[PDB]
Symmetry: none
Subunit: 37 residues, 12 copies
């Protein structure tokens, strides 16, 4: 592959699995800047 000189190689492979197998209630909220008077 690189017989003589100057063979710089960066190897990388990414695997990403985000599994959300819900079976129940997920009651989420996000109040940003809201002002309940």
């Amino acid at each position: 592959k690189c017989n003589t000189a100057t063979c710089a190689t960066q190897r990388l492979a990414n695997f990403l699995v985000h599994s959300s197998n819900n079976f129940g209630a997920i009651l989420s909220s996000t109040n940003v800047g809201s002002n309940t008077y």
Copy 2:
């Protein structure tokens, strides 16, 4: 492949699986800037 000189190679492959196999209620909210008077 690179017999003599100057063979710079960056390898990369991305896999991404976002599986959301819901079976129940997901009650979400987002109140940005809202003001309940």
Copy 3:
């Protein structure tokens, strides 16, 4: 492929699977700037 000099190569391949196999209610809201008087 690159016998002599100056062979810069960037490899990349992307896989993306966003599977949302819902089986239930997804009650979502987004109140931006809304003001309930």
Copy 4:
């Protein structure tokens, strides 16, 4: 058993220059 009620109100206002007034009751600004 006699009741007397009196209310004198003299609201006098004069302006000779400038007035800037702002009032945001239950108002917003984005």
Copy 5:
């Protein structure tokens, strides 16, 4: 058993210059 009610109100206002007034009751601004 006699009741007397009186209300004197003299609301006098004079202007000789400029007035700027703003009022946003329950109003918004985007």
Copy 6:
């Protein structure tokens, strides 16, 4: 058994220069 009620109110205001007033009751600002 006699009751007498009196209220004298003389609200006098004069301006000869500038006034800047701000009031944000229950208001927001983003």
Copy 7:
């Protein structure tokens, strides 16, 4: 005037003189909300 009882009296008289006997330039300005781009 008030011989027996109950004589409440409020006295008041207002004098106001706003004399502006100008003899020279009065260069005034008022930029409210104006935006000079």
Copy 8:
């Protein structure tokens, strides 16, 4: 005037003279909310 009882009296008189006998330049400004870009 008040020979027997209950004689409450409030006395008041106001004099106000605002004399501005200018003889020269009065260069005034008022930039409220103005934004010189």
Copy 9:
């Protein structure tokens, strides 16, 4: 005036003279909220 009882009296008189006999320049400014970019 008040021979027998209950004679409450408040005396007051106001004099106010605001004389501004200018003979020269009065260079005034007021930058409220102004933003010179």
Copy 10:
């Protein structure tokens, strides 16, 4: 004495949901 210039630009954008964007360049709000 040879010069070679190359520019490869692949600007790919995908949306599958909501986007709210605001931009006030040199603007004001009263």
Copy 11:
């Protein structure tokens, strides 16, 4: 005396949810 220039740019963006963005460059709010 040979010069070679290359520029590879792959700007990829994906969205699957919500984005709220605000930008006030030289703006004001009263």
Copy 12:
């Protein structure tokens, strides 16, 4: 006397939820 230039840019961004962003460059708030 040979010069070689190479620039490699892969700007990849993914979103699966919410993003709130604010930026006030030279902006005010009263």
